[PDB]
Amino acid sequence: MVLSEGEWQLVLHVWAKVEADVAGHGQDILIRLFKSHPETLEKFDRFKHLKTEAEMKASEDLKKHGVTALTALGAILKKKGHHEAELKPLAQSHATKHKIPIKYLEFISEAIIHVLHSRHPGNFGADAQGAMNKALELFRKDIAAKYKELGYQG
Ligand code: HEM
């Protein structure tokens, strides 16, 4: 797929608001993911012991990981589709070290979209949400093709 420049603009305009507080957004998103789909927490050996949302909120580690994850995504989105180099090391570790099925990349995409909708309603109307969704679908499609070259998904 290919996003138009107007679609990238909408994606990068809400992302600039996320960057005003990366750690806060990274915490919200990972928590939304774990609550919604608790099986995804089992992939994290570091965090699988966390029992409640209050424990999650208080985990410094968890918040440090959310910053790491978001920063990597942000770097991919700012490429506006030319992200081949960035995607390689990410597809290699998620496919052969962590073993994250595409399905889970779909659940986190849903969590990213829930949180932006809640926090940034004025900058995340229907067109901006469709543009974010296309960007995350592109990301997932390229990752999936890389998983296949790497010997992991299907
Ligand atoms: C927006 C999509 C995602 C991004 C951009 C992302 C990014 C990252 C980055 C930058 C790291 C550190 C370096 C590395 O190991 O490659 C990481 C580690 C990891 N990721 Fe992801 N990730 C994403 C989706 C997920 C999902 C959906 C899961 C699991 C349900 C997952 C599970 C993990 C695990 C288990 C690690 C290791 C954490 C630790 O022990 O240090 N990732 N990810």
Side-chain angles (χ1 to χ4, degrees):
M1 22 201 300
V2 181
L3 271 72
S4 71
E5 169 81 0
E7 288 170 334
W8 277 120
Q9 277 190 97
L10 289 176
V11 169
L12 292 179
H13 171 86
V14 71
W15 201 253
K17 309 308 187 194
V18 169
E19 294 185 337
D21 179 11
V22 181
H25 287 81
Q27 202 163 9
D28 276 10
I29 290 164
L30 283 182
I31 287 174
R32 167 31 95 154
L33 175 69
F34 303 151
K35 300 193 335 210
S36 279
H37 307 270
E39 61 259 50
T40 59
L41 181 57
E42 291 192 54
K43 292 276 171 181
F44 293 84
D45 283 332
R46 230 159 126 220
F47 306 126
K48 62 169 218 198
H49 61 295
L50 303 175
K51 298 171 179 293
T52 59
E53 173 177 342
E55 265 164 36
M56 285 173 199
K57 287 174 182 216
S59 166
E60 206 69 43
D61 256 36
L62 195 53
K63 156 151 91 32
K64 283 161 9 245
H65 180 67
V67 168
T68 293
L70 281 196
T71 301
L73 177 58
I76 285 169
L77 296 174
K78 283 158 178 170
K79 288 328 284 301
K80 294 158 56 163
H82 298 278
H83 51 219
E84 317 62 56
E86 292 67 34
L87 222 63
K88 277 169 134 138
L90 180 82
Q92 187 174 45
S93 67
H94 287 51
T96 148
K97 185 190 220 181
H98 315 315
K99 277 82 166 200
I100 308 311
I102 293 304
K103 166 58 110 158
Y104 288 11
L105 299 187
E106 276 177 2
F107 299 157
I108 197 175
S109 291
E110 160 193 321
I112 283 154
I113 282 163
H114 174 93
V115 170
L116 302 191
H117 177 81
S118 316
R119 295 184 161 207
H120 305 288
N123 284 312
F124 204 68
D127 287 350
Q129 176 169 334
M132 183 54 87
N133 178 59
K134 266 184 86 147
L136 294 177
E137 303 193 348
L138 177 57
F139 171 64
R140 276 191 257 169
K141 167 191 57 101
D142 278 10
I143 275 275
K146 268 302 163 134
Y147 270 11
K148 192 196 164 43
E149 288 170 21
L150 289 173
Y152 172 77
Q153 256 188 127

